[PDB]
């Protein structure tokens, strides 16, 4: 994550979810 925002459609990496 960017911390753990991460993984359910908001900020998983930079490209896959919304980031």
Topology:
Layout: no helix or strand
Count of separate DSSP helical elements: 0
Which sheet architecture does the biggest sheet show? none
**Overall helicity:** under 10%
Content of β-strand? under 5%
Number of β-strand runs = 0
Radius of gyration: 6 Å
Kindly, what is the distance between the CA atoms of the first and last residues, rounded to a whole number of angstroms? 11 Å
SSE-based structural type: little secondary structure
Shape: globular
Describe the structure.
This protein has 19 residues and is mostly loops. The protein has no helix or strand. It is globular and about 15 Å long. The N and C termini lie close together (11 Å).
What keyword list fits this structure?
little secondary structure
Concise account of the structure shown:
This protein is mostly loops and 19 residues long. It is globular.
